[PDB]
Amino acid sequence: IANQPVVIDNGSGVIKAGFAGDQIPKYCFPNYVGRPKHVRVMAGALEGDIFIGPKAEEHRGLLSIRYPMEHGIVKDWNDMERIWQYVYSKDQLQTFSEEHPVLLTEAPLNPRKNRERAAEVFFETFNVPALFISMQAVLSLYATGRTTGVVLDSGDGVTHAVPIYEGFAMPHSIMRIDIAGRDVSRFLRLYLRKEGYDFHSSSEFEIVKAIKERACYLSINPQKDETLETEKAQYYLPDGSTIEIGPSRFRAPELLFRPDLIGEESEGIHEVLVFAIQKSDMDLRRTLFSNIVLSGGSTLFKGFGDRLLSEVKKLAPKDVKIRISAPQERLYSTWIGGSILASLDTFKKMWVSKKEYEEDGARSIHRKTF
Amino acid sequence: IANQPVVIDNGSGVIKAGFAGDQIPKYCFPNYVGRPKHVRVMAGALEGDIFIGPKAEEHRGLLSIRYPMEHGIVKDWNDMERIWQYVYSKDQLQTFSEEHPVLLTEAPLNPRKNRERAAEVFFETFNVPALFISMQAVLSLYATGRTTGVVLDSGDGVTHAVPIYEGFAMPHSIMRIDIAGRDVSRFLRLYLRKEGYDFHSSSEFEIVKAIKERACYLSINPQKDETLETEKAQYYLPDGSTIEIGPSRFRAPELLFRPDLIGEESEGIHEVLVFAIQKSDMDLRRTLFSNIVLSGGSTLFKGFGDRLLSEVKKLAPKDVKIRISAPQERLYSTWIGGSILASLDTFKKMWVSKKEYEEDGARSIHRKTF
Amino acid sequence: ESYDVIANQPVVIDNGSGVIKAGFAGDQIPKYCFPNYVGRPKHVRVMAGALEGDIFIGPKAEEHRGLLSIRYPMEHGIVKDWNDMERIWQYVYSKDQLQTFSEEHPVLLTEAPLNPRKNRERAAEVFFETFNVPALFISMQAVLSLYATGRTTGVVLDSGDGVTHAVPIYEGFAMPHSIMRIDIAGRDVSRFLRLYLRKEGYDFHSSSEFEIVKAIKERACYLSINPQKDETLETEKAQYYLPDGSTIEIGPSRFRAPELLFRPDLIGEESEGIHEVLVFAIQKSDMDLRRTLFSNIVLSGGSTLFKGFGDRLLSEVKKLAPKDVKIRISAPQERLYSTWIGGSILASLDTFKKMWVSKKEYEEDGARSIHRKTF
Amino acid sequence: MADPKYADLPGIARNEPDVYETSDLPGYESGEYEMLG
Ligand SMILES: Nc1ncnc2c1ncn2[C@@H]1O[C@H](COP(=O)(O)OP(=O)(O)O)[C@@H](O)[C@H]1O
Ligand SMILES: Nc1ncnc2c1ncn2[C@@H]1O[C@H](COP(=O)(O)OP(=O)(O)O)[C@@H](O)[C@H]1O
Ligand SMILES: Nc1ncnc2c1ncn2[C@@H]1O[C@H](COP(=O)(O)OP(=O)(O)O)[C@@H](O)[C@H]1O
């Protein structure tokens, strides 16, 4: 028994933290640790060798950025645990981890060892009352308010499409690809270096990421815009210098639709959506084409809807009606879902208690999850 | 013994010495040894073959001036040791070197053997309790009371720019140039010879130094005054004779901005400042232009601020705010910095003890230099 | 039609950052090798019968170096000053070097991989507009080194004066996504060594004096198998004799300066080390090739000539490489001239006749012509 | 400030400006993407 459960969306790009019932996540910060590279010589300097969130955003130049989790897989647990320690700090939430239950939102088709280690931290380090792991796709629909529908969630770490019927995810029709937002930022960097703009440093790559998010358009006809001479729109850098992006603006984000550009022998994002529906039974295909939901950060590109709809038509069967629904709050659809689920009385039965974890161990979270 | 540490600003021109807690250096004397050239015939004459400070200032004509240290490097250690012995004499301070700790202020990017030999003297000759060598730039920040700021310290010996952000010094962005106040005085002398005024003697060169400090302005437009041929300002010599300085007044000090005039293929003082900032990371470059601190004696020329600000703006990015802060006590900013640092309780951990030096030797002071 | 301007012997020009290597296709060695910088006299001419001209290139600039101010037109394989580079390319066809008409002979240029498109594009315009060349073919540095050795498969670790890069090529197939280049090269090591000489108390402010620092680097610098061992121990200071006759004691700077290649953190650049670049480029390739690419490693560039480079690289690669993998590092005796000899062979091959782009095709399609038919 | 304390010293700059500075100068896309059979 507790006051109010805390929802924590373990996003690859940014961590979204808030209480169940809250309309928006109150505390959103980037999911990386910044350590100072330069030597401290003078007294009354910035104290601490660890900077997370707005403290790392303000003094970014001083710090070396290292992301603990890549493609939704935690490589460094020491850094990931310290970030969850920061979630309960005086900056974000400012509450006792033993007092409030936690709801975590993990990517689909993750290893079981991740959930087992994740559970150990919150029951051993943080002595949480109860922990409930939830899928990203199911929560996105709960937010939108549809029980049946295909969730095309193109995140910072991974892109995946989950066909869900009456709140149940079809484990055999799930399609996930490693290519995500981080690959577009690195792929754009390759074009900027060829144009003659170098961003070698990890601190400089965050500016390329800001440039990528600011200036990238998804062309309706690729070859037409390649052949036409661009205006070479200038972008103002932090120092004051101006860069001419030119054709690299729309040529970088094409990777999502053509993985052949980076050299990875995978299907395009438009093929993932159609292929995932075609795998499902004949009776649902028509409903799944009728109920398509867009999610993830990489869907925010201008003209994504018009380009995707055109690509789906080519791959989709003839005489099929295609209705693609994109909520205005795409980024916060997973969290808002967690807030609704946590608010439901059934949630009291759904989560795993600290006592149940101590008795059965790793089995406890596997039994009351699966 | 836990007495007040003695701060010694090892300037090429003047040595500034006092106890930690003192607002101003009580004892400031020129950094040169004067030896009598003339023969002693009469009894009751000036005793001693060595004269330092006010005794050498009063009887300058009798003495031959020899500077032991050039560009912050000690050429003659025997002479410098006698001057450091004079620091503990009955004239200045008048205390025991074994009773008080010592704080030395050396220039950045000095030779390793220069610092090593200096330290040996204060551990072997002078049985000092503890020795701490400090940077000129870091102490200037304690003086001003700012953790962040670019310190452009243009001394008599050497000119250097050290950019430090929130107490963090970037060791790769430091830029040092040999051209300094003493070289401008030699360069001015060349113009007086062209006008027809000879000052061959070492005692006479000190009058040229006095002329330089008295009558020299940095014109906002160099060529305008070169082409114009203004009225030759008259200077009164010690004997009573009058000299007409004329165009040499403003054309001599130009050397700081144009090293090509003496023939040295080095960067100008305005290029050193901007280049040292441009070496820094993109995020910090804008802040470093906003926070610029001027120090050193060679900044005291009339219109230095107006000329430098104009030259920096030309090289700096467009639409960036440039705010250059110059303390009125430019000469005495470095010493009072050493007094503040020595007054801090942490300082007890900072220095190297005589016992610690005897154990590890030069290795100890080489590690605990930065 | 038969005796056209296309049937003349093609001129190979290796556009090196340090030294330009020029000769005809079929020549065993590059006949004309000169430093890639322009020297202008800084001192004033007062007396008649003095050295004529305000521009000195090659042996004329080498013999009167003290008089001249050295300015490098190209940095990290990118042309900073085009006016100076055009004067050097005009000197390539002068009475001193080659002594032939640029409109009569075709040209083969060798550019570094992953260069800017505008850099190659501007260079091409000069050789079609200023120089009325019959045909121009831009070639990769890596592929030419393989023609020289006579191997279709092999990883080419070319550490030049301007840039260091590794290009993995399998049976004549270049993987364009596996190419890794870093700006850190021989010229930056000389600047890094200069910092250690000033700490010892030897000043070399002038651009002419920097060439002596480069000569000191080439004479006395060794790559220690264990860095920290030699750093902590006080080594014997090897003495070097300067042009004037003065002797300098170099000391520990010999092995502390060149370490930069393996530790970029020393200069403060957050880049990969030369040993990481080579291994990382192989690890990016498919599993089937990874073992063969470790088995077939080719060293190129001037910066491999440091003593104990081979022994140090092998130790660093072995640590990063998988266990029980056979590593065979192949070094040609003529490392410096391996790129040029490749260009000579390629140009002499009958297949080359299809490879080069005509002046006519350039005038029609423009930049598109030179951007196509390359790599 | 401490002017009467620094006043004893010969080399204190007065009648100069302290600071030299330059003149101060001056929608996400919605959903509902559909197409009929
Ligand atoms: N306006 C934008 N346009 C394009 N891409 C964007 C935009 N804003 C964010 N992104 C991308 O989306 C990412 C955010 O995804 P994120 O919220 O972490 O998803 P999840 O947590 O579900 O994995 C950013 O790192 C960036 O790559
Ligand atoms: N009013 C002045 N105008 C111009 N130059 C001056 C003025 N006063 C002093 N100087 C120059 O500044 C020098 C003082 O340098 P200083 O800061 O004492 O050296 P250091 O940095 O080695 O301690 C004098 O020797 C002289 O060359
Ligand atoms: N014996 C040597 N030891 C160490 N470095 C050397 C030696 N000889 C040459 N170098 C370095 O290699 C450079 C030559 O590089 P080079 O092969 O001409 O490259 P590129 O053709 O790409 O410009 C020289 O400028 C120097 O820095």
Long-range contacts of C314-322 (CB under 8 A, 24+ apart): C315/C225, C316/C262, C316/C273, C316/C275, C317/C275, C317/C278, C317/C279, C320/C275, C320/C276, C320/C279, C321/C279, C321/C294
If you ran DSSP here, which 8-state letter would residue C106 be given? -
Please compute, for residue C202, the number of CA atoms within 13 A of its CA located in the half-sphere on the CB side: 22
Q: Under an 8 A CB cutoff, do A194 and C271 touch?
A: no
Q: Are residues C37 and C208 in contact, defined by beta-carbon separation less than 8 angstroms?
A: no
Per-residue 3-state assignment (H helix, E strand, C coil) for B223-289: HHHHHHCCCCCEEECCCCCEEECCCHHHHCHHHHCCHHHCCCCCCCHHHHHHHHHHCCCHHHHHHHH
Tokens at C287, concatenated: 């599993």
Residue where the block lists tokens 């036409």: A228
Residues 6+ apart with CB under 8 A from B190: none
Closest residue by Cα to residue C54 from C26, C83, C77: C83
Q: DSSP of C254-299, one letter per residue?
A: HHHTGGGGT-GGGTT-----HHHHHHHHHHTS-HHHHHHHHHSEEE
Which of A194, A202, A262 lies at the smallest CB-CB distance from C116? A194
Q: What architecture is domain C6-141+339-373?
A: 2-Layer Sandwich (3.30)
Name the closest ligand to CA B67. Answer: 2
Give the fold, CATH level 3, of B179-266. Answer: Actin; Chain A, domain 4 (3.90.640)
| Distance from the A357 Cα atom to the nearest Cα atom in chain D, whole angstroms | 42
Signed CA dihedral, A21, A27, A33, A35: sign only: negative
Q: How far is CA B226 from CA B230, B249, B367, in A?
A: 9, 11, 51
Q: Are residues A320 and D37 in contact, defined by beta-carbon separation less than 8 angstroms?
A: yes
Determine which residue's CA is closest to atom 14 belonging to ligand 2.
Answer: B297
* Exposure b/e, A24-42, CB count within 10 A at least 16 = b: ebebbbbbbbbebbbeebb
Nearest CA in chain D to B25: D9
Q: Provide φ and ψ at A92, rounded to 5°.
A: -110, 130
List beta partners, residue A34: A51, A65
Q: Does A202 touch chain C (CB under 8 A)?
A: yes
- Ligand 1 neighbours by CB, cut-off 6 Å: A 11-14, 155-157, 181, 213, 296-298, 300-301, 331, 334
Ligand 3 contacts CB of residue C35 (under 6 A): no
Q: How far is CA B337 from CA A132, B20, B140, B143, in A?
A: 57, 10, 6, 4
Nearest CA in chain B to C68: B265
Q: In A, what residues contact D, Cβ < 8 A?
A: 294, 300, 302-306, 308-309, 313, 318-328, 330
Q: Are residues C160 and C17 in contact, defined by beta-carbon separation less than 8 angstroms?
A: yes
Q: Does B109 touch chain C (CB under 8 A)?
A: yes
- What is the helix (H) or strand (E) element at residue A242, kind and residue range? strand A242-244
First to last CA, chain A: 23
Ligand 3 contacts CB of residue C110 (under 6 A): no
Q: Are residues A148 and A164 in contact, defined by beta-carbon separation less than 8 angstroms?
A: yes
3-state DSSP call for residue B51? strand
Which residue numbers in chain D precede an interruption (C–N > 2.5 Å)? 26
Ligand 3 contacts CB of residue C273 (under 6 A): no
Spatial separation of the C-alpha atoms in residues D37 and D31, rounded to whole Å: 19
3-state DSSP call for residue C66? helix
Q: Are residues C296 and C151 in contact, defined by beta-carbon separation less than 8 angstroms?
A: yes
Alpha helices in chain B (DSSP H): 54-58, 77-87, 112-124, 136-144, 181-195, 202-214, 222-228, 248-251, 269-278, 282-290, 304-315, 333-343, 347-350, 354-360, 362-367
List beta partners, residue B6: B19, B102
Spatial separation of the C-alpha atoms in residues A296 and A317, rounded to whole Å: 26
Count of beta carbons in the 10 Å neighbourhood of residue C357:
20
List beta partners, residue A1: none
Q: Are residues A251 and C117 in contact, defined by beta-carbon separation less than 8 angstroms?
A: no
CA angle C162, C167, C171 (to 5 degrees): 145
Spatial separation of the C-alpha atoms in residues A220 and A311, rounded to whole Å: 10
Q: Are residues A283 and A141 in contact, defined by beta-carbon separation less than 8 angstroms?
A: no
Spatial separation of the C-alpha atoms in residues B65 and B69, rounded to whole Å: 12
Q: Are residues B68 and B33 in contact, defined by beta-carbon separation less than 8 angstroms?
A: yes
Q: Under an 8 A CB cutoff, do C69 and B111 touch?
A: no
Q: DSSP of C32-64, one letter per residue?
A: EEEES-EEEE-SPP-SSS----S-B-THHHHHT
Best of B162, B298, B329 for a ligand 2 pocket test (most atoms within 8 Å of beta carbon): B298
Chain B partners within 8 Å of A62 (Cβ):
165-166, 168, 284
* Exposure b/e, C40-53, CB count within 10 A at least 16 = b: ebeeeeeeeeeeee
3-state DSSP call for residue B367? helix
Spatial separation of the C-alpha atoms in residues C276 and C262, rounded to whole Å: 8
Give the fold, CATH level 3, of B1-136+334-368. Answer: Nucleotidyltransferase; domain 5 (3.30.420)
Alpha helices in chain C (DSSP H): 59-63, 82-92, 117-129, 141-149, 186-200, 207-219, 227-232, 253-256, 274-283, 287-295, 309-320, 338-348, 352-355, 359-365, 367-371
Give the fold, CATH level 3, of C184-271. Answer: Actin; Chain A, domain 4 (3.90.640)
Rounded to 10°, the helix C117-129/C82-92 angle is: 50
Which of B23, B309, B331 lies at the smallest CB-CB distance from D20? B309
Please compute, for residue B159, the number of CA atoms within 13 A of its CA located in the half-sphere on the CB side: 27
Determine which residue's CA is closest to atom 2 belonging to ligand 3.
Answer: C218
Residue where the block lists tokens 């969630």: A153
If you ran DSSP here, which 8-state letter would residue B23 be given? S
Q: Are residues A341 and A147 in contact, defined by beta-carbon separation less than 8 angstroms?
A: no
Spatial separation of the C-alpha atoms in residues D12 and A228, rounded to whole Å: 66
Q: Do domains B1-136+334-368 and B137-178+267-333 have the same CATH topology?
A: yes
Long-range contacts of B77-83 (CB under 8 A, 24+ apart): B77/B117, B77/B121, B79/B33, B81/B121, B81/B125, B82/B33, B82/B50, B82/B52, B83/B15, B83/B31, B83/B33, B83/B52
- What is the helix (H) or strand (E) element at residue C111, kind and residue range? strand C107-111
Q: Are residues B117 and B123 in contact, defined by beta-carbon separation less than 8 angstroms?
A: no
Q: Are residues B216 and B250 in contact, defined by beta-carbon separation less than 8 angstroms?
A: yes
Count of beta carbons in the 10 Å neighbourhood of residue B118:
21
Q: Are residues B26 and B56 in contact, defined by beta-carbon separation less than 8 angstroms?
A: no
- What is the helix (H) or strand (E) element at residue B163, kind and residue range? strand B159-165
Spatial separation of the C-alpha atoms in residues A320 and A297, rounded to whole Å: 28
Q: Under an 8 A CB cutoff, do B326 and D5 touch?
A: no
Q: Does A329 touch chain C (CB under 8 A)?
A: no
Residue B258 φ/ψ region, left for φ over 0, alpha for ψ in the -120 to 50 degree band, beta for the rest: beta
Residues 6+ apart with CB under 8 A from B361: none
If you ran DSSP here, which 8-state letter would residue A261 be given? G
Name the structure determination technique: cryo-EM
Q: Under an 8 A CB cutoff, do B113 and C203 touch?
A: no
Residue where the block lists tokens 């880049």: C271
Count of beta carbons in the 10 Å neighbourhood of residue C99:
9
Is the domain spanning A137-178+267-333 CATH 3.90.870.10? The answer is: no
Rounded to 10°, the helix C186-200/C207-219 angle is: 100
Residues 6+ apart with CB under 8 A from B352: B130, B131, B132, B364, B365, B368
Residue where the block lists tokens 């709809």: A309
Which of A43, A204, A240 lies at the smallest CB-CB distance from B320? A240
Residue where the block lists tokens 């004997």: B239
Spatial separation of the C-alpha atoms in residues C234 and B102, rounded to whole Å: 29
Is the domain spanning C142-183+272-338 CATH 3.40.50.300? The answer is: no
Q: Are residues B32 and B68 in contact, defined by beta-carbon separation less than 8 angstroms?
A: yes
Tokens at A320, concatenated: 């099929």
Spatial separation of the C-alpha atoms in residues B212 and B249, rounded to whole Å: 8
Name the closest ligand to CA B12. Answer: 2
Q: Does A194 touch chain C (CB under 8 A)?
A: yes
Tokens at C91, concatenated: 């000197």
Spatial separation of the C-alpha atoms in residues A42 and B335, rounded to whole Å: 16
The subunits that touch chain D, with at least 3 C-beta pairs less than 8 Å apart, are A, B
Long-range contacts of A229-238 (CB under 8 A, 24+ apart): A235/A211, A237/A207, A237/B282, A238/A207, A238/B282, A238/B283, A238/B285, A238/B286
Question: Residues B83, B84, B87, B89: what is their CA dihedral angle, to the nearest 10 degrees?
Answer: -80
Residue where the block lists tokens 């309790």: B129
Q: Are residues A103 and A7 in contact, defined by beta-carbon separation less than 8 angstroms?
A: yes
Q: Under an 8 A CB cutoff, do D18 and B322 touch?
A: no
Tokens at B135, concatenated: 């940077």
Spatial separation of the C-alpha atoms in residues C30 and C301, rounded to whole Å: 16
Q: Read off the amino acid at residue C145.
A: S
Spatial separation of the C-alpha atoms in residues C108 and C114, rounded to whole Å: 18
Count of beta carbons in the 10 Å neighbourhood of residue A285:
16
Residue boundaries of the structural domains of chain B: 1-136+334-368, 137-178+267-333, 179-266
Q: DSSP of B314-344, one letter per residue?
A: HHSPTT---EEE--TTTTTHHHHHHHHHHHS
Determine how β-strand C164-170 pairs with β-strand C180-182.
antiparallel
Spatial separation of the C-alpha atoms in residues B167 and C322, rounded to whole Å: 43
Q: Does D27 touch chain A (CB under 8 A)?
A: no
Residues 6+ apart with CB under 8 A from C81: C71, C73
3-state DSSP call for residue C353? helix
Residue where the block lists tokens 């603990």: A68
Q: Under an 8 A CB cutoff, do A195 and C117 touch?
A: yes
List beta partners, residue B177: B159
Q: Are residues C144 and C16 in contact, defined by beta-carbon separation less than 8 angstroms?
A: no
Spatial separation of the C-alpha atoms in residues C324 and C161, rounded to whole Å: 34
Tokens at C273, concatenated: 């080390």
Q: Are residues A184 and A298 in contact, defined by beta-carbon separation less than 8 angstroms?
A: yes
3-state DSSP call for residue B80? helix
- Exposure of C230 by Cβ count < 10 A (0-12 exposed, 13-18 middle, 19+ buried)? middle
Spatial separation of the C-alpha atoms in residues B203 and B57, rounded to whole Å: 10
Q: DSSP of A169-180, one letter per residue?
A: E-TTT-EEES--
| Distance from the D21 Cα atom to the nearest Cα atom in chain A, whole angstroms | 18
Q: Are residues B329 and D6 in contact, defined by beta-carbon separation less than 8 angstroms?
A: yes
Spatial separation of the C-alpha atoms in residues C20 and C32, rounded to whole Å: 8
Nearest CA in chain B to C268: B172
Which of D28, D31, D37 lies at the smallest CB-CB distance from A321? D37
Spatial separation of the C-alpha atoms in residues C253 and C258, rounded to whole Å: 8
Please compute, for residue B135, the number of CA atoms within 13 A of its CA located in the half-sphere on the CB side: 26
Closest residue by Cα to residue B344 from C284, A43, C324: A43
Closest residue by Cα to residue A299 from A319, A337, A328, A336: A328
- What is the helix (H) or strand (E) element at residue A182, kind and residue range? helix A181-195
Chain A partners within 8 Å of C118 (Cβ):
195-196
| Distance from the A329 Cα atom to the nearest Cα atom in chain D, whole angstroms | 9
Spatial separation of the C-alpha atoms in residues C39 and C72, rounded to whole Å: 9
Spatial separation of the C-alpha atoms in residues A251 and B120, rounded to whole Å: 65
Name the closest ligand to CA B10. Answer: 2
Which of A179, A195, A200 has the most C C-beta neighbours within 10 Å, making it the best mutation to test the interface with C?
A200
Spatial separation of the C-alpha atoms in residues A285 and A280, rounded to whole Å: 6
If you ran DSSP here, which 8-state letter would residue B153 be given? E
